[PDB]
Design a protein around this ligand. Structure first.
Ligand SMILES: CN(C)CCc1c[nH]c2cccc(O)c12
Length: 262
């Protein structure tokens, strides 16, 4: 089965990135700490949420014995997915100011800025995910449907995606446009490599996560069986981003390539 492969890849990649950050004195800078936070969030996603999803697949999408695990499982899934998404959004926003104003960004760059960045993204992720255990356990219908564990709150699914993958998405495309504008208008080879890396990262993020959110919104604003079957695969397409984020955010460095090979 090609789902155990996904969980193994997620765990191994995030563990290796955390090891590379921790064991190398040359990689302890303000950006790599945020990258390690991304790795931690992706590892938690791949360890706590994904194998339970494979177990749900193995039982024909019939929940295992403890019914109380559904609401907390949805909480953890949404929390870690949002944490990854606005981690990427913060990375893009930080790169825009690093490229447009390098001197001022370096002058204002500090450990305090990185800690503020981390707490800001995690605080927004916590605020977005807040109602799920408050109301998911108060009413079992909001987290169950036809005997399968899935959230069935139409209003939250519509607005809760409008501040998780559509306002962050608008920010990310605007930032991508402004950065490719900035990097183009001996030192040009570095800028070309940076533009290529930014394009690969942005387009992979969009192509992996956008299908799931698009069909999720289409399942509410609008077929039901087809859309559900599509969601069942697109959620794992999105989960695979946790196994792709470390490799595309770290392996372009020779230090990370050497550490992975050690
Ligand atoms: C299913 N899982 C990949 C979580 C994705 C998610 C992030 N934020 C949300 C807000 C509402 C409904 C959701 O599925 C989400």
């Amino acid at each position: 089965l090609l789902t155990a492969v996904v969980i193994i890849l997620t765990i191994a990649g995030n563990i290796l990135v955390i090891m590379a950050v921790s064991l190398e004195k040359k990689l302890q800078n303000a950006t790599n700490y945020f990258l390690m936070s991304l790795a931690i969030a992706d590892m938690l996603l791949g360890f706590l949420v994904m194998p339970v999803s494979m177990l749900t697949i193995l039982y024909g999408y019939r929940w295992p014995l403890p019914s109380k695990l559904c609401a907390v499982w949805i909480y953890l899934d949404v929390l870690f997915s949002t944490a990854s998404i606005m981690h990427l959004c913060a990375i893009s926003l930080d790169r825009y100011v690093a490229i447009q104003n390098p001197i001022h960004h370096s002058r204002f760059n500090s450990r305090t800025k990185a800690f503020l960045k981390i707490i800001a993204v995690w605080t927004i992720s916590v605020g977005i995910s807040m109602p799920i255990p408050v109301f998911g356990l108060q009413d079992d219908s909001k987290v169950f449907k036809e005997g399968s564990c899935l959230l069935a709150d139409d209003n939250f699914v519509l607005i809760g995606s409008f501040v998780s993958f559509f306002i962050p998405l608008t920010i990310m495309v605007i930032t991508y446009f402004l950065t490719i504008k900035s990097l183009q208008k001996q030192s040009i080879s570095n800028e070309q490599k940076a533009c290529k890396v930014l394009g690969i990262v942005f387009f992979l993020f969009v192509v992996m996560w956008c299908p799931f959110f698009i069909t999720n919104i289409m399942a509410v604003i609008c077929n039901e069986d087809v859309i559900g079957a599509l969601l069942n695969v697109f959620v794992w397409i999105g989960y695979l981003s946790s196994a792709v984020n470390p490799l595309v955010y770290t392996l372009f460095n020779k230090t990370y390539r050497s550490a992975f090979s050690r």
